[PDB]
Scaffold this active site. Structure first.
Site, short mmCIF file in Angstrom:
data_model
loop_
_atom_site.label_atom_id
_atom_site.label_comp_id
_atom_site.label_asym_id
_atom_site.label_seq_id
_atom_site.Cartn_x
_atom_site.Cartn_y
_atom_site.Cartn_z
N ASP A 100 -6.79 2.25 6.31
CA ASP A 100 -6.19 1.11 6.98
C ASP A 100 -6.67 1.07 8.42
O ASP A 100 -6.85 2.11 9.05
CB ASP A 100 -4.66 1.16 6.93
CG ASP A 100 -4.02 -0.19 7.22
OD1 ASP A 100 -4.43 -0.86 8.19
OD2 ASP A 100 -3.10 -0.58 6.46
N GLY A 117 0.81 -1.21 0.00
CA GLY A 117 0.00 0.00 0.00
C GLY A 117 0.84 1.26 0.00
O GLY A 117 0.57 2.20 -0.76
N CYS A 172 -11.39 -31.00 14.58
CA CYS A 172 -11.57 -32.34 15.13
C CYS A 172 -10.29 -33.16 15.10
O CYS A 172 -10.08 -33.99 15.99
CB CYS A 172 -12.67 -33.07 14.36
SG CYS A 172 -12.78 -32.64 12.61
#
Ligand SMILES: Nc1ncnc2c1ncn2[C@@H]1O[C@H](COP(=O)(O)O)[C@@H](O)[C@H]1O
Ligand SMILES: [Zn+2]
Lengths: 531, 157, 313, 77, 77
Positions: free
Chosen positions: A44, A25, A169
């Site tokens: 931002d 950016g 799991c």
């Protein structure tokens, strides 16, 4: 200026927003400023971190602690105050950045690291028909991509998922990779310090103080002492809060008792190697690189665990009533906690110790990046942007960046912009209308009947607001939403520039509603569709 | 949240309302404001004829993350019940909704719900996800059956 | 390792990619840089951020009004001041623990011994004869030689490592190789009329040819292209293109006439990208951690592609 | 079986086998499974031609030991 | 119609006859016939690709007598 005037004046008169004050950016913003772009919008949510300085050349050491957008603006005033820069310390998912907030811009490029934000800006720009330039950086890797409504494929034409979260799991019973125990530690931190998210709950809930081993040997007790439900499954978070986060009690619960509880599954360890339980007493009393790159002993890890849980308990005491503590990749206490837990789990399952450096690497999913690739990606982005504003979309092409030249002796590879997929449901030419209405007085009853049922021949309307999270406003089955038909749209958070999706179960045709707030409609009517 | 997930969930809701198994329930959750979020659902699974779980109507919540349908939904019974394959925090696991084995984006809500139903009708030993129910079902079958009946009457409609 | 904790934290991202040892070797590295076109500024910034302990840059020109209004290093209105001294403040502000050096002397007058204390030399906006001089000195001193520039949508770089050693990841854990490259006089002055070069030419980018045209024009006109003199200079580039390619033995049509409309500019995007790749090559060579690309790489911005090529091996 | 080469964007060399009529679907799924990367995150390129999901070896018509390029459109920018 | 070429871990080959567009019935009946073992604790790998419970050969891309091999169960983890 060396730019062509037909394009130089266009970029000096138009308005372009770039999202995300990353290294990509900041380099992007500098390239735009040098190119001659006059009005640029920067947003931002994050602040400048110490580790952030490796790539963000606009941010200095003194700038830690402030918002990224503000510091980027201040830095660009250091060499070109003439540019019109608008800074926003917020996230894009904030609903105030509606379709009208994007329609004002002539061009827009994304510089995000999170997939969800990228998808959201994709959807928003396609709503506002503002061209997008997709990009991403990782190590010595990079790419750029033009996103144009109805010409190129949108970023959602090929659905790309977010970061790997793992099933849960597998990690909650039998970790087999360092990533497994790392996400196990993250889930356990969320369980006993974060919110009551039962999905993140990874430590078993039972009669916690008991050192369980083969309860079948006490079958009469298992149904005489407590009724069905296992003493109503005392919560791990509640247990830890009640016990005052005792380091020894917590350590034995999550490293000795629960390990034996897992060891009750002989059917699991007949194939997998059974783990081993570690007790605090024996571990404590048993008797160069960076400071984070060397593996420590289990006793040292236990000491770090105790110190980290003490500090985190203090921080929780700074909060009220047990407020959740959000995990982060830079907080020393929480991060020490997660590395200690992960290494203890690795020693539990007979796996090698992993240094704090690697835990920092794969815990927050920190993607390495060099300012070289960041700079080249930003330059590609601005080159593609000036091509787009020139109208040469046909010449716009997807360009990748390589660490090593390809066998075709190319380092930046051009690829033609693939036409959009006709059935990804987001870039398709779905019919849309815009209706101006007074949000603060029109109600859900009117929205359902007058605006949809008779105005657009919907016999089974189930209008749905696409706020970026997903919720239906009304249901075709009246038994589901008739209790809130008398509420206002302002009561449900539909502001100006919002949009809804309508559908029918019998007309099987969808219609999109765009919301414009209009007080000037007077008293005789509450709505009007714009022709 | 990806728009593809939203559109797919809307299509799944339409298909489920148009056709679904009898006395089954699958609806988006009532948001505190009164709306329903299609990305997180309330479901209730009835028992099967002659099975020990017949008569009970077991409530189940399922969670959809932003990667759906690339990623499977995470399901969970509220409150947690006494079955070997369900973590006593409530969440349940099966190859149907696990990435690395069988999870196909093309599958629908109805078939995964039927999968959970037959999983409840099929308590397995080769993949234990819980201890107490596993050991009782493996060693003392009659107490397991009694507890299953007690649960079935506990979650009766 | 003598790496301090906060210095490692500032470098924390790149250590996860190329490791501590590469960063330590960079801390043992010193780099010489020349010329401050947008490309020189970007390469200085990227080298500063990379972690080389000391960067020395050299230039022979001040800041002129005809320069663009933004160079992202020098302060606003620094016209008349020396570009090196106009940039050093921000360059040091980019990273405080790296020391930088500024030289106003022309590299033409610079003695041979001045290059000895550097492990890499970078060149920009300079005459081809001086490139030959600096490159042969660098090869004599066993130092790694790099150069490159940007002109409109077109940009190039060159790298001569001499006898070089490096490691790589075992991508189907590190393993050691080596590579050898030739000076500019071997590379730039390659005889294309030779049968093998002629055969490779038909699948060889014309970016080298336009680079040679630009280089020649720089040497004979004494200055870089400037937008105020587009027409006469453009015709000069066209005619000198014909002259050089027919003299070199290749058809001038291989460089289409519209190449002038692209190269006759200085733009931030094409500058930044080629500088980023040059910095990547520099840090790979200094760290000896990644395999350097072959001696030449070129970029066509309007075509949107970059090509690595081998010339005069 | 008819042999082809796939070289990664990170210079990673992977070597695979196919029939003329065997859809490249299998090939790309196999690659992303071996690399452990989500499918839609990879782009497959042949000499500049994007490899479509509905593509088959008798359509692009490669020879044996030919190279098929892959590039991974990574996030984290 | 489709000639099945299923072989188990014990190298036991069982023949069946199914239609082109069989979707789930093939694998369901193969499981129920050869099982000896609970259904969830078994898997077939088809050209190295693990199938789904509805993966038809026509949309898989296989044909008559194509060899299909089972794989050791992954339920243990
Ligand atoms: N939703 C969002 N809103 C605003 N900025 C964001 C958002 N998501 C990521 N960013 C920024 O995008 C940049 C990406 O990270 P990096 O490029 O590694 O600095 C960072 O500056 C983030 O703060
Ligand atoms: Zn699309």
């Amino acid at each position: 200026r060396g730019l062509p005037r037909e394009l130089a004046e266009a970029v000096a008169g138009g308005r372009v927003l770039v999202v995300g004050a990353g290294g990509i950016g900041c380099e992007l913003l500098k390239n735009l400023v040098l190119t001659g772009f006059s009005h640029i919008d920067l947003i931002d949510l994050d602040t400048i971190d110490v580790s952030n300085l490796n790539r963000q050349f606009l941010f200095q050491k003194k700038h830690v602690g402030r918002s990224k957008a503000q510091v980027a603006k201040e830095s660009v005033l250091q060499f070109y105050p003439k540019a019109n820069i608008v800074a926003y310390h917020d996230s894009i998912m904030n609903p105030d950045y509606n379709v009208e907030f994007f329609r004002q811009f002539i061009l827009v490029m994304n510089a995000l690291d999170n997939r969800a934000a990228r998808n959201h800006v994709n959807r928003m720009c396609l709503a506002a028909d503002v061209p997008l330039i997709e990009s991403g950086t990782a190590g010595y890797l990079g790419q750029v991509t033009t996103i144009k409504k109805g010409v190129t494929e949108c970023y959602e034409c090929h659905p790309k998922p977010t970061q790997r979260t793992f099933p849960g799991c597998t990690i909650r019973n039998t970790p087999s990779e360092p990533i497994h125990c790392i996400v196990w530690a993250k889930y356990l931190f969320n369980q006993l310090f974060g919110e009551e998210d039962a999905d993140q709950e990874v430590s078993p809930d039972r009669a916690d103080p008991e050192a369980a081993w083969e309860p079948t040997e006490a079958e009469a007790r298992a149904r005489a002492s407590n009724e069905d439900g296992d003493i109503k499954r005392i919560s791990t978070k509640e247990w830890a809060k009640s016990t005052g986060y005792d380091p020894v009690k917590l350590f034995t619960k999550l490293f000795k008792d629960d390990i034996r509880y897992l060891l009750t599954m002989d059917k699991l360890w007949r194939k997998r190697k059974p783990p081993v339980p570690l007790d605090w007493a024996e571990v404590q009393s048993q008797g160069l690189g960076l400071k984070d790159q060397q593996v420590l002993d289990v006793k040292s890890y236990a000491r770090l665990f105790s110190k980290s849980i003490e500090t985190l308990r203090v921080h929780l005491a700074e909060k009220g009533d047990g407020a959740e503590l959000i995990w982060d990749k830079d907080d020393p206490s929480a991060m020490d906690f997660v590395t200690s837990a992960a290494n203890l789990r690795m020693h539990i399952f007979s796996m090698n110790m992993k240094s704090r450096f690697d835990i920092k690497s794969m815990a927050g999913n920190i993607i390495p990046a060099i300012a070289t690739t960041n700079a080249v990606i930003a330059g590609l982005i601005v080159l593609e942007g000036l091509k787009i504003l020139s109208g040469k979309i046909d010449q716009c092409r997807t360009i990748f960046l390589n660490k090593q030249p390809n066998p075709r002796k190319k380092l930046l590879v051009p690829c033609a912009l693939d036409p959009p997929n006709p059935n990804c449901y987001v870039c398709a030419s779905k019919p849309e209308v815009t209706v101006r209405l007074n949000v603060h007085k029109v109600t859900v009853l009117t929205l359902q009947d007058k605006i949809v049922k008779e105005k657009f021949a919907m016999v089974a309307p189930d209008v749905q607001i696409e706020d970026g999270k997903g919720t239906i406003l009304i249901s075709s089955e009246e038994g589901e939403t008739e209790a809130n038909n008398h509420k206002k749209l302002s009561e449900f958070g539909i502001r100006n520039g919002s949009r809804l999706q309508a559908d029918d179960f019998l007309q099987d045709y969808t219609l999109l509603i765009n919301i414009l707030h209009s007080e000037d409609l007077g008293k005789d009517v509450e709505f009007e569709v714009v022709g | 949240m990806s728009g593809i997930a939203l559109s797919r969930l809307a299509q799944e809701r339409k298909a489920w309302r148009k056709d679904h198994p009898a006395q089954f329930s699958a609806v988006p959750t009532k948001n505190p404001d009164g709306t329903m979020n299609l990305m997180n659902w309330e479901c209730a699974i009835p028992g099967k004829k002659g099975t020990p779980w017949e008569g009970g109507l077991f409530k189940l919540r399922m969670l959809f993350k932003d990667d759906y349908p690339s990623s499977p939904p995470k399901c969970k019974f509220e409150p947690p019940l006494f079955h070997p394959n369900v973590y006593p925090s409530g969440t349940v696991c099966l190859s149907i909704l696990e990435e690395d084995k069988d999870w196909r984006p093309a599958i629908t809500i109805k078939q995964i719900l039927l999968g959970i139903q037959e999983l409840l009708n099929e308590p397995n030993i080769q993949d234990p996800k819980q201890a107490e129910a596993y050991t009782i079902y493996s060693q003392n079958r009659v107490e397991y059956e009694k507890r299953v009946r007690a649960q079935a009457r506990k979650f009766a409609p | 390792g003598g790496i301090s904790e906060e210095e490692a934290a500032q470098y924390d991202r790149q250590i996860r990619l190329w490791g501590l040892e590469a960063q330590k070797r960079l801390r043992a590295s010193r780099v010489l840089l020349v010329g401050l076109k947008g490309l020189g500024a970007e390469i200085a910034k990227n080298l500063i951020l990379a972690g080389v302990k000391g960067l020395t840059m050299l230039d022979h020109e001040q800041v002129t009004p005809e320069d663009p209004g933004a160079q992202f290093l020098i302060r606003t209105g620094s016209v008349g001041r020396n570009r090196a001294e106009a940039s050093l403040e921000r360059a040091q502000n980019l990273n405080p623990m790296v020391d930088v050096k500024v030289d106003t002397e022309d590299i033409e007058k610079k003695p041979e011994s001045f290059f000895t204390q550097f492990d890499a030399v970078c060149l920009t906006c300079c005459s081809r004869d001086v490139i030959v001089k600096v490159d042969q000195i660098c090869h004599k001193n066993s130092i790694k030689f790099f150069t490159g520039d940007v002109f409109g949508y077109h940009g190039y770089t060159f790298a001569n490592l001499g006898e070089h050693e490096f490691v790589e990841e075992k991508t189907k854990t590190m393993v050691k190789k080596k590579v050898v490259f030739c000076p500019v006089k071997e590379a730039l002055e390659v005889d294309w009329s030779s049968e093998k070069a002629k055969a490779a030419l038909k699948r060889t980018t014309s970016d080298y040819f336009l680079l040679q045209v630009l280089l020649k024009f720089r040497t004979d006109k004494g200055r870089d292209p400037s937008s105020d003199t587009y027409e006469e200079d453009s015709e000069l580039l066209l005619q000198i293109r014909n002259d050089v390619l027919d003299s070199l033995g290749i058809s001038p049509d291989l460089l289409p006439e519209d190449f002038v409309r692209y190269c006759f500019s200085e733009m931030a995007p094409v500058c930044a990208v080629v500088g980023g790749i040059l910095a990547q090559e520099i840090v790979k060579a200094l760290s000896q951690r990644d395999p350097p690309h072959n001696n030449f790489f070129f970029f066509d911005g309007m075509k949107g592609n970059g090509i690595v090529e081998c010339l005069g091996p | 079986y008819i042999k082809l080469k796939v070289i990664g964007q990170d210079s990673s060399e992977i070597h695979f086998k196919v029939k003329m009529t065997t859809h490249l679907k299998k090939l790309k799924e196999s690659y992303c499974q071996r690399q452990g990367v989500p499918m839609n995150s990879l782009r497959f390129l042949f000499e500049g031609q994007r490899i479509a999901d509905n593509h088959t070896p008798k359509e692009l018509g490669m020879e044996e030991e030919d190279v098929i390029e892959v590039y991974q459109e990574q996030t984290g920018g």
